[PDB]
């Protein structure tokens, strides 16, 4: 795919993904530490028939921050588009939600952005 | 314009705003505690000539969380629309940003939503 393969952000994290012909995204997200304890499952969806006029390909994916080694009681979703070409990139906005009590729900959700590239 | 006056959210905060002819919003935001130490200045802007097709009136405002008594080294912006009628409301989404060092910038910005009404 143009999407299947390995993608890097500027902070050091790596996303390894396969884009299935049916619109599935599956893979692994590895934090900066690069450790076995730093790998987490990801799953998502993408538009498997995008426009052919230069427009990006919509996609999103989720990581829940639990593996066999640690649990941060949180989940991040990224929502964004793949832009292909020699300077291919995936531009996203993300929402990180932590489990909270009802009272503390106000601080449940962080917002931010990430750009991923094919080269580090 | 219909906006001038006192509004309440469901958490028990109050905001007292004056809508100026020129598009200005000025007022006070009072937290649920209600005392002098809980009062903060607000300023914002609104569309002083909204559409007449039934559309809402766009507006936004900022509070910086510093008064003469305390400083939380943060600011919130509310972006939304006023909906008039017997059961008037202001429907908003907000962004709360805290000042952080560069390394902690990822946890700088919370997102949420609020609805204000004319009655408690």
């Amino acid at each position: 795919a143009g999407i299947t393969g390995t993608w890097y952000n500027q902070l050091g994290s790596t996303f390894i993904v396969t884009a299935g012909a049916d619109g599935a995204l599956t893979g692994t997200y590895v934090t900066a530490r690069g450790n076995a304890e730093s790998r987490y499952v990801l799953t998502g969806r993408y538009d498997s028939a995008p426009a052919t006029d230069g427009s990006g390909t919509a996609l999103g994916w989720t990581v829940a921050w639990k593996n066999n080694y640690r649990n941060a009681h949180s989940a991040t979703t990224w929502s964004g588009q793949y832009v292909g070409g020699a300077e291919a990139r995936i531009n996203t906005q993300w929402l990180l939600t932590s489990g909270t009590t009802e009272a503390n729900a106000w601080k449940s959700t962080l917002v931010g952005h990430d750009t991923f590239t094919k080269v580090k | 314009a219909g906006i001038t006056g006192t509004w309440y959210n469901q958490l028990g905060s109050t905001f007292i705003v004056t809508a100026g002819a020129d598009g200005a919003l000025t007022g006070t935001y009072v937290t649920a505690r209600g005392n002098a130490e809980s009062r903060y200045v607000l300023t914002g802007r609104y569309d002083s000539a909204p559409a007449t097709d039934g559309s809402g009136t766009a507006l936004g405002w900022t509070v910086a969380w510093k008064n003469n008594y305390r400083n939380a080294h943060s600011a919130t912006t509310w972006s939304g629309q006023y909906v008039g009628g017997a059961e008037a409301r202001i429907n908003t989404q907000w962004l709360l940003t805290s000042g952080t060092t560069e390394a902690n910038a990822w946890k700088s910005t919370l997102v949420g939503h609020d609805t204000f009404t004319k009655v408690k």
Binding site: T31, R33, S38, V63, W65, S74 | W106
Partner: peptide, 6 residues
Amino acid sequence: HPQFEK
């Protein structure tokens, strides 16, 4: 938070 750890 793991997303941001070094």
